[PDB]
């Protein structure tokens, strides 16, 4: 996260760290959506241009964390993957269209003060909140600049689709939205390397619950003027999420 702030303890209890088993390192962010399902970016697991193709056994999920590097004894929980599910129409070749994946955990994680799931949007929350100028929140342990001691947080406004499109030569789709400030707005901030797969969340003013509207997906650079971060549109892919969960528990 570039130009964010340190998280408060328990501020993002759905936050998940994707962790490489050997060499032990951060791979990506991710989010907890139930006591056995974790949501992330497909490109965290599969990205052939960079020879990335992880299997279950290559990975761990670390939940309840705050410190990046520290083993947070009696607080974090470390989980093994049962199965990875990548969107069947994930476009890694071109623009990361449908950049989404589910991970099923071997065993359910115990909720606690620091571990708790985020909601997924229904159509009406999505329609109410996914509006230009409305702000969401992005969290992650990735680069501070184009690495932090603790989880970082940044609040960023959703940007109008024409402005998103005019900021880049990449083809953008209805399965993505972009967020960040304009040059003229002053304020700045963005996701960066290692924040991939982490959640873009919004607090519904209707029921005061946090919903995950986006997944950190792609950008050109980090926190560049006139550029915006791009997020997987979670509501647009909810049919596939539900099918998977419904079909594999």
């Amino acid at each position: 996260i570039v130009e964010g702030s340190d998280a408060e303890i328990g501020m993002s209890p759905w936050q998940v760290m994707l962790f490489r088993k050997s060499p032990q390192e951060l791979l990506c962010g991710a989010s907890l959506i139930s006591d056995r399902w974790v949501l992330t970016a497909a490109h965290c697991l599969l990205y052939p241009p960079w020879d990335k193709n992880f299997t279950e056994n290559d990975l761990l999920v670390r939940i309840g964390k705050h410190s990046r590097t520290r083993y947070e004894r009696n607080i974090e929980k470390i989980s093994m993957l049962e199965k990875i599910y990548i969107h069947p129409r994930y476009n890694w070749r071109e623009n990361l269209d449908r950049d989404i994946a589910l991970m099923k955990l071997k065993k359910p994680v115990a909720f606690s003060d620091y571990i708790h799931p985020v909601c997924l949007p229904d159509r009406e929350t999505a329609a109410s909140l996914l509006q230009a100028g409305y702000k969401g929140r992005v969290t992650g342990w990735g680069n501070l600049k184009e690495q932090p001691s603790v989880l970082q947080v940044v609040n960023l406004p959703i940007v109008e689709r024409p402005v998103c499109k005019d900021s880049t030569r990449i083809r953008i789709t209805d399965n993505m939205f972009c967020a960040g400030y304009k040059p003229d707005e002053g304020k700045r901030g963005d996701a960066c390397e290692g924040d991939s797969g982490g959640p873009f969340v919004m607090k519904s003013p209707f029921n005061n619950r946090w919903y995950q509207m986006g997944i950190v997906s792609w950008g050109e650079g980090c926190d560049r003027d006139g550029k915006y971060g791009f997020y997987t549109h979670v509501f647009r892919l909810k049919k596939w999420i539900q099918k998977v969960i419904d079909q594999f528990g």
Binding site: S5, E8, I9, G10, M11, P13, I33, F111, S112, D113, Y114, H116, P117, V118, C119, L120, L129, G133, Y134, K135, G136, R137, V153, N155, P157, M202, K203, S204, P205, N208, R209, W210, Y211
Partner: peptide, 27 residues
């Protein structure tokens, strides 16, 4: 059915330091 309510914030009626920034943008 308890999703999105954080134990150390909404469950306690405590607000975090910048969530009001999000509410104010929901115009």
């Amino acid at each position: 059915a308890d999703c999105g309510l954080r134990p150390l914030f909404e469950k306690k009626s405590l607000e975090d330091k910048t969530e009001r920034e999000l509410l104010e943008s929901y115009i």
